[PDB]
């Protein structure tokens, strides 16, 4: 358990309140630089997003995975990646769960099904 | 610590790294030196392993 | 001290995957070997990717595409899963250009024919348009070494164009695991097993190989100058 | 340290001297010109479990 | 006879937390600390 | 250390740290018969 | 690509200091690691393979003019290290002997061909009024902690034999400060500590676990039982 919740319970950070939004506060190409130029932490509130929720763009499970290869987040962040067949918002923790689950369960398709994908895993 | 620094060295990456989280965890105090949020923790009974 | 040398056998796939396995190993090498194997699969390896992005109409990831059905974000995660080789043994950088058409499925081969490079997924969604679709492409292509975050380099080929997340690093994917077998009265005898998964590019296989090489050119500096 | 002694399994002397004989078969001393006791040191023997 | 340890022998701290050993291992392995020296008993949390 | 087990490292079987002494006690004891008395010489049949 | 620059600092026996400057991101530790393991386990050391004394039939037992015992005195020795300078020297046998009032202490072992007590001092054992002693040790070249309940010792009878500490190496640690060099700016400086007792220099051992490693690598040479299930 202990083991599988840390890899899947994701993080939330507090230097950084008027963040996120329905329509892009400022933009993106300075919502970001703010980061590079300290103040609010990738993941953290906001009514639409964090910096992570936008400094991450991955592709395959594998990326947001060769990701963590470089300390660049911690499988808890809250990246963007598209799993599958559509767009996520979880964490590079979360999704290997599954992946794990799948792969040696053999339908990485059917696994996600049972999986309840979004919230600390547990007894 | 005085007889690691004392030999010419002083926390590398591996240990930052740690204190990098250890902070967003608030166990170590933000806004301090690597070498700090090092002793702040250390004296927190802990450290890098 | 005593023991044999290793058996090495490896299960090979074809292009992707590779369950090499060497068994023979005193307590302790297992890890000793792979782990640092594996950050250097995973690391310095010599590949190729995406590194810009020009597309005739609208500047911005986050925009508005008429005439197209899918948007810029996702075009981007699709043109990294493509991979491209060199066949000029010294030319690390090249340029490509994509054209559309009306109501079609764009596809990883239909990309300017050009000699000098090699498409190695020619099927790829990429996009599709419905009606009259525009789609010029402006792709600019790098010879890099690991990952570099589109954010730690800033490309600069074009004024409208978008950089992208170079991913040309073949290493996609390599987990190992020592358990340990047995050979004689001896039971905690290490058993490494190394699994590298690849895109069509760069053999697993050779993805060890150009590791080890590396890893060992890497040694030669301990040397006694 | 107390436990030790109120053991008895430790060995202690009764009266302040000083030694002369010391090995591990035995311990002769010269106590206070009250004589020169030399008590064995029970080597290797056997408990009950 | 020397006795030594023997993966399974038991012991405990003075604290109540009884626990026999599985896996004696090597000074490669071992936890280390940034100075080289490393530890002994890796005693797991969960216990406590 | 699962549970409640504990990992040790090699190290103190090197340094020998955590051995113990023990000494087995054994017994015997010959009796009086009507088959014959139950003597104990280090004379004793087919032992080579 | 650039080419490293590596550190020659050592000095005493004990202690040395390796450093390779313009290293790649992340290889800091791809080597300081493996080397490491390398030394502390498979570095070729020295000991006390075994031991005789007097009137001794077991470990267990005493002698009348030392306060150790058998214990006391063979774990003072598994500890004390020999230089065998020569290759040619598979295995010897060192001798000591006590007389009269006296204390022991590694220096009083009578020297010889290719040999050296490199630790001098090392307290062997007590002494007073008329303590016997002499002792015929034997040394071998081993790798490893190897225990006695799974070598035995054919000398004679009464030959107790004893637990190896081969592996050389005592304490190794590594470093990996940033970096100040033509390039970016996230790189690894690659150092490592590496203590030694008697037996070898730091370096020796270091040149000895990267052929090692080395060794160990080259295994991934051709392959066998190829192809996989479609």
Redesign the interface.
């Given at each position: 358990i202990?083991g599988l919740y840390y890899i899947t319970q994701v993080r939330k950070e507090k230097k950084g309140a008027g963040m996120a939004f329905a329509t892009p506060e400022e933009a993106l190409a300075a919502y970001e630089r703010g980061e590079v130029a300290l103040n609010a932490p990738i993941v953290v509130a906001g009514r639409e997003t964090s910096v992570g929720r936008l400094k991450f763009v991955f592709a395959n499970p594998d990326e947001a995975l060769l990701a963590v290869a470089h300390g660049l987040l911690d499988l808890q962040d809250v990246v963007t990646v598209r799993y599958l067949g559509r767009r996520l918002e979880t964490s590079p923790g979360r999704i290997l769960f599954a992946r794990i689950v799948g792969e040696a369960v053999g339908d990485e398709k059917v696994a996600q099904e049972l999986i309840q994908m979004d919230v600390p895993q547990e007894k | 610590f005085g007889?690691?620094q004392g030999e010419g060295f002083g926390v590398?990456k591996?240990?930052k790294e740690v204190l990098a989280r250890a902070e967003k965890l608030g166990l170590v105090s933000p806004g301090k030196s690597p070498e700090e949020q090092l002793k702040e923790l250390f004296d927190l009974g802990k450290?890098?392993? | 001290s005593k023991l044999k040398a290793p058996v090495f056998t490896a299960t090979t796939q074809g292009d992707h995957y590779g369950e090499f396995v060497l068994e023979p190993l005193e307590?302790?090498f297992g890890?000793?070997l792979g782990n640092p194997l594996r950050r250097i699969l995973l690391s310095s390896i010599p590949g190729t990717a995406v590194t810009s992005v020009y597309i005739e109409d609208v500047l911005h990831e986050f925009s508005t595409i008429p005439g197209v059905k899918e948007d810029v974000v996702e075009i981007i995660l699709n043109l990294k899963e493509l991979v491209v080789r060199f066949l000029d043994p010294k030319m690390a950088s090249t340029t490509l250009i994509l054209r559309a058409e009306g109501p079609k499925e764009v596809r990883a081969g239909d990309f300017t024919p050009s000699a000098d490079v090699e498409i190695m997924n020619p099927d790829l969604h990429i996009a599709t348009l419905e009606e009259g679709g525009k789609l010029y492409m402006e792709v600019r292509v790098d010879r890099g070494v690991g990952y570099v975050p589109a954010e730690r380099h800033g490309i600069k080929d074009r004024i409208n164009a978008i950089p992208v997340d170079a991913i040309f690093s073949p290493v996609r994917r390599v987990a190992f695991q020592v358990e340990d077998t047995r050979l004689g009265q001896r039971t905690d005898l290490d058993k490494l097993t190394l699994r590298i998964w690849t895109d069509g590019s760069v053999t697993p296989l050779e993805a060890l190989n150009q590791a080890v090489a590396i890893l060992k050119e890497h040694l030669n500096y301990f040397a006694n100058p | 340290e107390r436990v030790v002694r109120d053991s008895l399994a430790a060995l202690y002397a009764e009266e302040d001297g000083e030694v002369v004989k010391v090995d591990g078969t035995r311990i002769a001393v010269r106590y206070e010109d009250g004589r020169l006791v030399e008590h064995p040191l029970r080597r290797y023997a056997r408990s009950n479990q | 006879?020397?006795?030594?340890?023997q993966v399974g022998?038991k012991?405990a701290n003075r604290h109540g937390?009884?626990?026999?050993?599985?896996?004696?291992?090597?000074?490669?392995?071992?936890?280390?600390?940034?100075?080289?020296?490393?530890?002994?008993?890796?005693?797991?949390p969960?216990?406590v | 250390?699962?549970?409640?087990?504990?990992?040790?490292?090699?190290?103190?079987?090197?340094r020998?740290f955590?051995?113990?002494?023990?000494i087995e006690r054994y017994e015997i004891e010959a009796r009086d018969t009507k088959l014959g008395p139950e003597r104990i010489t280090r004379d004793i049949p087919h032992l080579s």
């Open positions: 202990l | 007889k690691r590398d591996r240990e450290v890098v392993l | 307590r302790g890890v000793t | - | 006879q020397k006795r030594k340890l022998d012991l937390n009884k626990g026999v050993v599985a896996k004696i291992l090597p000074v490669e392995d071992m936890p280390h600390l940034p100075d080289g020296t490393p530890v002994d008993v890796i005693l797991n969960l216990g | 250390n699962f549970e409640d087990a504990i990992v040790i490292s090699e190290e103190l079987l090197k020998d955590y051995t113990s002494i023990h």
